[PDB]
From Swiss-Prot, chain B:
The gene is DAPK2. It comes from Homo sapiens (Human). The modification Phosphoserine is found at residue 288. Keywords: Apoptosis, ATP-binding, Calmodulin-binding, Cytoplasm, Cytoplasmic vesicle, Kinase, Nucleotide-binding, Phosphoprotein, Serine/threonine-protein kinase, Transferase. This is Death-associated protein kinase 2. GO terms for molecular function: ATP binding; calmodulin binding; identical protein binding; protein serine kinase activity; protein serine/threonine kinase activity. The chain holds residues 12 to 315 of 370 of the full protein.
Length: 303, 304
């Protein structure tokens, strides 16, 4: 249901480089007819199967197909799609506010109430996807972006659907991918996959946001994978001394091997840490603080 | 048992770039004291754990540790190891004859006998490693190099020990890594690992050498992995019509899920396709022919 076969330079003014990854190169641009600004993600095509360099026809078509389905305020949106010999270039919504974790590291101070405000935006985006039977499959702090950095409470935008995949019911889908720090046990063990995996990733992102520490990350990839498979973590009191039991329960109910016993997105929204029932839960959440001292320490180390 | 802490440029004249990967950049260089030529692999260090960019202290130390054990004509050899704020640089034997598969694609013609000549060199290298309880863990056509391209029968050198690991006996090793096209089922399934894995790789490498095709490679990674785990392949007669049964038996005994029932390096070397026992096995091997037609076709598609 296809791609524009024109030259993207005819219709857009490409300029500054925004941030290249391993397979794509993102650049700011400007539609000519309107003057509006977008991002332009130049994905590099593959050549024949098993060129290490590039991305396959099938997997670009998949990402573009999912992007078209996806209309939500907490999820990036696709404007147009061109292609040529070398690249397929996507004209995406310009999200120029930086990472979430970046903005949070700037923070003078940050309570668990303020923290859940950002978590909730994420849960809303992920709820929209999961309602449309889509699994992002690459939930991590790099892919959690801000539209405008200079707002009191900025607007989260989930990005990068390179690993996303529609889930059907009778159909199985097994594959190994992602960043080891943030993958569920079913990825590592090459077990059937679904929407559940995103809920694991959320439990991890939460853990790092509050404490600055990461639950399963070892010295080496080897260890990391052994930790995930064994579900070996703990709330080390050095970082989690100012963290609520509500917050810890949320994380603990997400970081669960059995996919069926793990929280759904609908259950995570209804969890009391995200949606307090009484006043005393609301106040515990207001008086609990994110560990920004240790969160800055670890976020600096990622550069 | 450490790294030189001096500036590598003081002692070596670095020059032309030779072939950067993702974590390392390799450059031709020249020892100043001797005038001799080496390859200098500049490995980029990590910063703190999970920087996607870099290589960890522990994993550089392991590569260097395995490199210092490794003395064989069919295996690259480590000369020196400097380091600095940014990189650990290894001074490795210069291997400048290109990949094996590249040389073979230049071939006028190539019989199974001539092919096993190169396969033997590979098995000899691998045997040496496996005798020293080392697993390469990254056997593939890119890491099978030639020393001098312009010789009738060139000299194979296994390279890149970035994934290599010493296998003990009681000790278990489980990890996920490598190139999907060439990993054994135990990698994919996160099952305990050892020397066997390399042998599966050799089976895949042989398969491609002979036919130009690849046994498990699918359209997407998803399919490739399913194919490995299911051990789903076949000898499509379009590519294997001029391939001997001996050749097909060797491959078939290596591409086996069960690690115990798979061929060991010693069993591979003794296999009749490698080591005939009568004259008629020898003749079948001379008269059977590598499919350079299809081999070139695919090897071209892997380019730039």
């Amino acid at each position: 249901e296809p791609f524009k076969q024109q030259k993207v330079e005819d219709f857009y003014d490409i300029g500054e480089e925004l941030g290249s990854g391993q397979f794509a190169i993102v650049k700011k641009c400007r539609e000519k007819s309107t003057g509006l600004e977008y991002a332009a993600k130049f994905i590099k095509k593959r050549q024949s199967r098993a060129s290490r360099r590039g991305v396959s026809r099938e997997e670009i078509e998949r990402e573009v197909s999912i992007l078209r389905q996806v209309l939500h305020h907490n999820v990036i949106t696709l404007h147009d799609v061109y292609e040529n010999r070398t690249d397929v270039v996507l004209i995406l919504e310009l999200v120029s506010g930086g990472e979430l974790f970046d903005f949070l590291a700037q923070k003078e101070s940050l309570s668990e109430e303020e923290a859940t405000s950002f978590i909730k935006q994420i849960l809303d985006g992920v709820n929209y996807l999961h309602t449309k039977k889509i699994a992002h499959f690459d939930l991590k702090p790099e892919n959690i972006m801000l539209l405008d950095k200079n707002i009191p409470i900025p607007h989260i935008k989930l990005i990068d659907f390179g690993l996303a995949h529609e889930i059907e019911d009778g159909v199985e889908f097994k594959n190994i991918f992602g960043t080891p720090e943030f993958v569920a046990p079913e990825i590592v063990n090459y077990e059937p996959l679904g929407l559940e995996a995103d809920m694991w990733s959320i439990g991890v992102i939460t853990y790092i946001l509050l404490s600055g520490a990461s639950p399963f990350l070892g010295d080496t990839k080897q260890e990391t994978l052994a930790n995930i498979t064994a579900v070996s973590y703990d709330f080390d009191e050095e970082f989690f001394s100012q963290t609520s039991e509500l917050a810890k329960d949320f994380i603990r109910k997400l970081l669960v091997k059995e996919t069926r016993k793990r929280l759904t997105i609908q259950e995570a929204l209804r969890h009391p840490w995200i949606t307090p029932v009484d006043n005393q839960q609301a106040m515990v959440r207001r008086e609990s603080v994110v560990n920004l001292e240790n969160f800055r320490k670890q976020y600096v180390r990622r550069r």
